[PDB]
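Figure S7 source data.
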Amino acid sequence: SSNFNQETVTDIHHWTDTLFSFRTTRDPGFRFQSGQFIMMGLEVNGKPLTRAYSIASSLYEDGLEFFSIKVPNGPLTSKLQHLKKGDQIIVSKKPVGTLLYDNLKPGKHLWLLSTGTGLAPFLSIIRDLEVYERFEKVILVHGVRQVAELAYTDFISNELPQDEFLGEMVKNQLIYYPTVTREPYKTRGRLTDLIRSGQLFKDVGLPEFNHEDDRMMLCGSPEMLAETKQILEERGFTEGSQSEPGEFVIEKAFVEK
Ligand SMILES: Cc1cc2nc3c(=O)[nH]c(=O)nc-3n(C[C@H](O)[C@H](O)[C@H](O)COP(=O)(O)OP(=O)(O)OC[C@H]3O[C@@H](n4cnc5c(N)ncnc54)[C@H](O)[C@@H]3O)c2cc1C
Ligand SMILES: NC(=O)c1ccc[n+]([C@@H]2O[C@H](COP(=O)([O-])OP(=O)(O)OC[C@H]3O[C@@H](n4cnc5c(N)ncnc54)[C@H](OP(=O)(O)O)[C@@H]3O)[C@@H](O)[C@H]2O)c1
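Tokens for the predicted NAP complex:
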């Protein structure tokens, strides 16, 4: 109103029939921290129709980016799927979220554990110089059902290591670990199963989580997150907050409404 900026769509790409990304302009007033979410959506019948969305773009990029589900009868995404370049969206002005470095004690390895659209905030974090200064390795796990749901997989593997500003840090420090559950692919499984078997650690070449070295951000389905939270706490890791830095922090990629 006043609670929103209007932005224009500058590009759009559909990954699958349930996943798409788009880029927009960015109001010069807008600021956020990598990992945060805002309310995004459309003016519908002169009223805002908005939903929580992670900001997928890099923190000082002159533009915004969203990585979105398409839910066929979802009030927002049943509309938002039909976006075209030039269309208007609205974006709220007060970012929030728990996916923040300072909610974590200092460490050596940051594991970004995601399913589905829960990759979104991590697309911002892995484009933040700050993360590479704070952590010697950043391990991005992205778990999906189908190989075509590995949104950004060519960008992450092939383009991002060539970035002028981030490329050498990414070549040296980012370990990208896509995994698929329901189609043939070189890496298969749920990240829960891959942690319990030890397979994750063997494949990325790092030791099993330890209290001194390893920190985690989790973003994905409620079920993944409840199960992975139990895994980490059984291993002695504690949830961080702003008042008390811990070893992991959690954000839902969506809620079952
Ligand atoms: C902190 C937070 C951040 C979020 N960030 C994102 C984001 O970056 N991208 C995004 O696409 N959504 C994200 N969501 C989900 C988003 O808020 C909306 O639910 C989504 O835009 C769909 O809106 P809708 O009105 O079409 O359907 P809704 O009525 O909101 O959702 C209906 C149902 O669709 C399913 N659902 C909704 N969102 C998702 C999803 N992302 N993945 C899988 N299933 C889903 C659930 O079954 C849900 O009950 C986030 C939610 C939270 C709480
Ligand atoms: N938390 C929930 O309530 C939840 C969870 C998943 C799906 N869904 C339903 O399915 C739709 C799509 O969900 P989605 O975007 O999460 O996509 P999805 O394609 O259902 O799942 C994404 C990836 O997460 C894995 N996964 C599922 N449960 C997990 C767990 N407990 N721990 C670790 N990984 C797990 C999946 O493995 P598998 O192939 O083995 O399932 C898959 O590889 C939702 O909109 C909703 O209707 C709900």
